[PDB]
Amino acid sequence: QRQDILLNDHWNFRFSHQVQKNTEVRVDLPHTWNAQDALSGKPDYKRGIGNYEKKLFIRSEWQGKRLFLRFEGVNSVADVFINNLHIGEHRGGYGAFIFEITGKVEYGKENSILVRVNNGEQLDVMPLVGDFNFYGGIYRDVHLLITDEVCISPLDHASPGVRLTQDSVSHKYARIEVLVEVSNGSDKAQEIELGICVRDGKRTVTERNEKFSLSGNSDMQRRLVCEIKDPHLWNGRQDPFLYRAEVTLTRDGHVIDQVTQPLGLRFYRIDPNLGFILNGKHLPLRGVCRHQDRSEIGNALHLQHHEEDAALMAEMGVNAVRLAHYPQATCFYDLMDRYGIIVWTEIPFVGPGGYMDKGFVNLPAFRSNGKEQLRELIRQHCNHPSICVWGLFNELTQAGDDPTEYIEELNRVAKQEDMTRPTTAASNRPATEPMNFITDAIAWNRYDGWYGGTPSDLGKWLDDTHKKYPELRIAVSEYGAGASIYHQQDSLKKPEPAGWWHPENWQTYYHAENWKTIASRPYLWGSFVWNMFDFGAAHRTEGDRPGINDKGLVTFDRKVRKDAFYFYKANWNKEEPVLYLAGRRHTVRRQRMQTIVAFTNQPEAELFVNGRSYGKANPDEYAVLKWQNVTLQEGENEIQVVSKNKELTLSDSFRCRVES
Amino acid sequence: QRQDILLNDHWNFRFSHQVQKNTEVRVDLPHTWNAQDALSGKPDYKRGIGNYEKKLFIRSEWQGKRLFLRFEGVNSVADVFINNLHIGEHRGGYGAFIFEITGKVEYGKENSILVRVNNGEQLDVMPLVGDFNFYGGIYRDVHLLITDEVCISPLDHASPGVRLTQDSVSHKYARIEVLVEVSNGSDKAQEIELGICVRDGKRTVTERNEKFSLSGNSDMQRRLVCEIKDPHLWNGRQDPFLYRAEVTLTRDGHVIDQVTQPLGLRFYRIDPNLGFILNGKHLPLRGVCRHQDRSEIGNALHLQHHEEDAALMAEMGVNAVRLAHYPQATCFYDLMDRYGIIVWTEIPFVGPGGYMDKGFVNLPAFRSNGKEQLRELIRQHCNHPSICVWGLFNELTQAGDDPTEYIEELNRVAKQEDMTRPTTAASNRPATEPMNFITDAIAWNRYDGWYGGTPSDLGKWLDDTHKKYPELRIAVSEYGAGASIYHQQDSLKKPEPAGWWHPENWQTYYHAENWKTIASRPYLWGSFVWNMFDFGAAHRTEGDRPGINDKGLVTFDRKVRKDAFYFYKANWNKEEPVLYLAGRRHTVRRQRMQTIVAFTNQPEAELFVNGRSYGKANPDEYAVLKWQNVTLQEGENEIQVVSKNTLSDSFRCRVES
C-alpha cells in the first residue's frame, strides 16, 4: 500500500566553488566527491559545499497522500530546498534524517529537490578529528515516501516509527513492548485500528490490535504489549533466529499503512570476570572492526559491498564487530542480524589519538548536536538484535576542554532511550581517568608491539587494570598492526610504524601473540581487531602508499586476504577446513634455512620441501604449525603442506626462489 | 593609565589538516593563509581551520586589574582558548570582537592563547557568496587591553564604550548625547566621577561631569548631554575639522581610565531631486569603491597600505568612498575622518550577481548572525563623522529564499542603533522589486557598456526610474570597466568581458562616457566607481591573469594608475596641476593616423608630434583634449603636450604598418 521510491538516479552536481553557470555534471547516487582526492593521499582534500539538484515530477494522484524525502546519510551538514525554498537543515554525517514535502510541492508538475551539502570543518559537529576520511556527499540512498494521510509516522528522528523493546527474556517467556508513532495528517478525526502481528515466516506467533480515535492534524504515541512463551531465541551464529514484526493501521477494514521490522529475542549480560554471557552461556566475542569505505569509491557503497564485507568476516569466523567510528547503514546491521554477529556501534565522538587538536570542544552547539546524534543512533537502529552495546566515544582526552561531564550527560541520554543494552566506550586514557568509569562497559585501544613495546606488555597491562578495578567490564576496543602485501623479508624485525615499510610477516607475528594474550583472559568480554579491512585515511604516509591505514586483515579492495586473516580463520572457523601456508608472498629470499609456518584447524599436517618431507606436526593451541631449520636450495623451491583426515585430504603450496 | 599592548608578534600556526605533531610554523600578525593560493587564481583555495597559538606572560602586577583580548578582524569563525580551555566563539569575519580573560589566566606565569580560526564555507554566516576572496586568518591587529577594575567598558559588541550621538546640528548650535558604559569589576561598591572634555587642539570646548556610586560587579550606562555653541562643522574635504572627545573615569581625585573618540559635527540630507546636501550646501559625491586587499599580502594589510590607498584616493579628487562589501578597518575610517571623505559602509549581505547560489538562506542562525553583524558595524564605528550611510545588502535576489522581510527586519535594527544616519543599499533588481524601497536611500550597480549595451543606456534607465519613482533617492552604487595595463590596441572596440583581452583604451572610453552621464544628473546623490583598485577574486579568468577583478583605476599593487585615474583626477582635482596623455602604454601601433587624447585641468594645451605643432586646444566639459587626424611617422615617434599658465607630458612609440 505504502510506497518507497528510490531517488538515486540522475542528479546534477557542482561545487559552490564553481561559481559560474552551466558547470553542473551528472552524478548518480550514492556519491562522494572525495573518492579521488582523499583516496590519493591528499591531506587537504575538498571539504566544503556541494550542490545536488534533482527534478521530480509530483503526480496528481499523489495529492491527498503524504510525501517524505528520507536521506540515509549525508556528510556532514545538509540544507534541503524544494523549488529553491529552504525546508530544513541537518547537521551530522551518519544518522538518517527526513523532511515532509506534502505541503511544499506543486501537484501535477515537475519540482526541484536541491540538497546543499557541506563536509567542511566545524568545531560544533562531531566528529572533529579522526584517523579516517570525512567523505563529503549524499553517500547513502535517498527515498520518496508516500503514505496515507493517517500513517505510522516516519518523522521521529527518521526512525521507522515502530520501536520494539525486550524485557524478561528467558528460554520460557519474553515480553515485547511496541512503541508506535501514529500521525493523522487529515483535517478530520479518524477511528483507526492499530495492530501488531509477530510472525515466523507466515505463521502468526502473537497478535494484538486496538481501535482508537485520533483527532485531525494530531499525532500521538501508542505502546502495545504482547508475549511469547517458549520463544525461539536469537543465539548469535549458533542460531540467528529472527521474527518479523508487522504493525498495521486499518480503517473500515483494509490496510492503509504498514511497517515491518525484525525482532530477535535474546538476553545477555557482561560479567566482570566471566566475559560475555549470551542467553545463559559464555561466548567469546571474536571481534573485528569495520569502516564503511572501499577502494576507488570511498564510502559511496552499494548493497553488494556491504554483503561482501559481511561474507568475509563470516568466513574468518568473526562473531562480533565494532562498527567504527560512527552510525552505519541499516543494511549492514541487517546482515549482522542475519549472520548472528554481535554489534558494537557508537556515535562519532572521536578524539585525536596520537594526532593534533581535540574531539571535544566546549560549545553549546557541539554538546547539543552530540545528544541529537546519539538520539538518532538509538531510535533508528534499536530494533536490530545484533546491536548489544551503545558506544559513546573513541579516544577522548581530559586535557584542554574536559568531556567527562558531557560524557556522563550522554550516558544518561542513552539510558533515557534504551535501558536494555549496556553502554561502552573505546578509551586510550590511563585507567585512573574518571571517563573510564561512566559507561556500563569499558575497553581500551592497545597496540603493544606496533606503536612501541612488545605484545607481552598487553596482558600485563590488562591483568593489572582488572586487579585494581575488579568491577570494570574490560575489553580490547582495538589491537592491530600494519602490513603491506608487497612488503616481504626473511626475518621478524619490528618495522617503524610511521615509515614506508610494513612487512607482512610482522602483522602475522603481532596477531599470533596478541590473540594468545587475549585467549588466556576470560575476564575480557571481547576483543576487536583494528581492522578487518584497510581503510582510507588521507593523512597517512606509511606502508606501500600514502593515504591508507594498512592494519586491515584484508586489502582495501577486498581482493586479498593477508596471512593473519587465515590465522584467525584457523582459530575461529572450526567448520570450513583450513590449511594455509604463511609467507607465500615472500617469493625472493636471501636465506637458505627458514622457519616455515602454516595455519590449520586439522589435527595434523606434514610439510614437503622440493618433495622432501620435513615431518608431520600438530598445530599448537592457536592453530599454528611450525617447522624450524628448513633448508631450502639455491634458486627455485616448492613448499607444500598436506593433511589427511579420513576422506578429507587438504593441500596448500607455493613456490619461491633463494638468492644467496 | 589604561595599557594597550599589540600582540601581533610571533605566533605558532598549523592547519588542522596537518594532523601530525611538530607541524607548527611561525607567523606574524596580521596574517592570512590565502595570500598565495587564492591570489594565484586557485578557485578552491583553502577554506578550513587554522590554529594560532601565542605564549603570553601574565605579570603579577596585573593581578587586580582587568585583562581584555580584542581582535580587530578574524575571518570568519573564531574560537578562543585560554590555556586550551574554550572561552567563546565569534561568527563573522569583519567586525571586531572581545573577550575578557581577567578570571581565565594564572598571574605571574606563562599562559597560552589558542585561536582556532575557520574560513570554511557556511550557509549561516554572511557573506555566503561574493565576487571576492574570503581570506582566512587573523588578518587584523590583536591587542591586550589592561584597565582598572572599574573601567569604561570595552565589552559591548567590542565598541569603544563611548557613543557620540549628534541629536541636533546647525551652523549655530550642536547638541551631542554621550553614552558611556561603565563596568565595576570590583566586589565592593565604588563612587566614581565620570567626565567628558571636548577639546580643540588643547582648548576645552565644553565639559560636563557627574558623580555616582556603582555597586560591585555591576554595569551601568550613563548619558551626558554636551552642547557646543557656534560649532566648527566637519565640512568634507573643504574643511575636515575634528574635535577630540576625551571621556575619563576619576576616583578620589585621580584619573583611572580614559577613552578618547573623534567628534566631527555635521548635518546633511539626501534630497530625492537635488542629491546630497552637506551642512546646507550641495555636494556631488564623486566616489569609488574599495576592497581591503593588495597584491602578495591578501587582506593582511598594514597601516601604510591603508594610508597609501587613502592618499591615492585624495590625489584623484575622491570625496566619497564606498567600502565594499563589509565593515573595514577602524584605521581606514580614521583616514576618511581626517581627509574629509564621505563613507558608505555596509554589512556583508552580498548576493550572487552574475554567479551561482545565494546571498540569503532562510535559516534562523543566518538571520540571527546578520543582525549581530549589523549591530557590530554601527556600535563599533558610529563615532566616525565620515560614515554617512549604512548599507544593508549588495545584489540580493528575490528568487528562491526571498530576503525581503529579513531586509525590513535589518532596516529596523539599524534605526534602533542609529537614527542620525540614513540606510542605503546596492541593488541589481528591476526597480519593481519591493526590496528596493525598504532603505532610506537606494542605488544600483550598473555596467552599461561593459556587460552588454552602451553607456547611453545608463541615463535612460536612470531617467526612466526617477520619473517612475520620484520619491526614490537614487545613486549609482557601481559602474566600471575592466582594463589591463598590458592590453593595448589602435582602435576602440568592445572586448568580451569574460575573455583574456581587456584593452586599456576601452576602460578609458567607458569611464569618460559614464561620468558624462552621471555629471548631467544631479538627482543622483552619488556615484561610486567599481573599483578604485584592482582586487582579488580567485574565480576570475579574464584580463591579463586569473584571480583578479581588473575594473580598477589603479593596479592591484597600487603601483600604476591607469588612464582613467587621470581622467577623474583632471575632473575632480582642480588643486593639483594635471596634464596627462592617454595611451602611453600603447607603444607599438599599426596605423599611421591617430586620434591623440589628453586630460587636463589647465585651460588649454598644445600637442607636438616629432616637434611639429598640431595646435593649441581647449578641454571639453570633461577635461578631455582631443586632436584628430594626427599623422605619425613610420618607426619611432615622440608625442608631447605642453601648457602654460608650465606643464609638459610626453611618451614615445613606434609605428609598424
Place this chain on the structure above:
Amino acid sequence: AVRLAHYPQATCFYDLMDRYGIIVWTEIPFVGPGGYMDKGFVNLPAFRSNGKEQLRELIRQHCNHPSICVWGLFNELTQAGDDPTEYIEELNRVAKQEDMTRPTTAASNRPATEPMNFITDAIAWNRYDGWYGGTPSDLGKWLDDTHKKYPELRIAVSEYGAGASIYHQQDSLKKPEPAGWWHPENWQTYYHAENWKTIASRPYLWGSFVWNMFDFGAAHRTEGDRPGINDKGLVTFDRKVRKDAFYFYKANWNKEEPVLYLAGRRHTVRRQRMQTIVAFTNQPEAELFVNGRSYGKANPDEYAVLKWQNVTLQEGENEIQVVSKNKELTLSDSFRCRVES
C-alpha cells in the same frame, strides 16, 4: 657594475647598461647546486655540445655591447661526482676563439685549492659570512688569506647578501636563522654596512656584487615572509619599496642626488625606550629632532652613517625627524613610532 645572473639577458637591457655606463658581467647558465641537491654538470655528450652552443650564442649575440666587460663561465659548480673541470677548460678555450678582447671569469663556491678556480682570467667567490654562518669579519680574513696564497689571482666578490622582509621588524640586532620564517630588516642593513666596509678597504678586489638588487622568484624557498621568494634584494620583488640597505649604498655611491634617510622607519612598534637612531646621508651634517627636541648635530662617518646613541623615547607616540642644511638645499626626513614597554 652589474652581474647579470645567471644567463644571457635581453639586448635592450644590455643597451640600457651601455647608455648608463654600467660595466656588465654576463654569463652562460652553467649553474651549480649551491646548498641544494643534484648537479649543475652531467657528463653527457649532448650536455657538453649544447653548452658550447650556448656560449657561442652568448658572445656572437651581445659582443657589440661595450658595457659587457667580463664573460662568465659558471656559478657554484662542484668537483664531486662528474668533475666539470676539463669541460670548464674547453668553454674557456671557446670563449678565446670567440673573443680575445674581454677576460673570462666565474663565480665559485669551491675551496680556493680547486683547479676550476684558475682556468678563467679572473675569478670571484660567493660569500655570505654573517648570514649563512659566521661573522661579517670572516670575509675579510678569507679574501686576504686567499690573496696572499695566490697573489696572481684577480679576485672579486661575485655574491654577498642577506635576506630581509620589510614586514619583519624588531628592537635589537640578533642573527636570524636563514631558512626560517623570520628575516628582520635591521639585520640585512647591518650585514651590508659591515660587508661593504670589508670590501671598501681591499683595493685588490676588482669588484663586488650584492646578491641581489631585487628580491626574485625561487619557488622552492620557504623563508622570509612568504614562500617562493629569494628575499635578499635591496628592493622588493615589485620594484615598489626600497629597503634600508638600498639607502646605505645610495648615500655611499650616489654623490649627486642628495640623500638623508633614517633607518628603521618600518619598525613602528618598539618595546624599549632607549634607541640608537641611525641615518644615511651624503650631506655634510644633520640634526636629529625627537618629539621636537634636538639630540644635536652629527657628521656622517666614512660610510655615510649618522648615529645618535642613547635616544630616549616617550611611552606611546613618538616623532623622529632628521634635518640637513647645505647652502641652498634643506633636507628633512621623519617617521612616526610607538613605544609599548
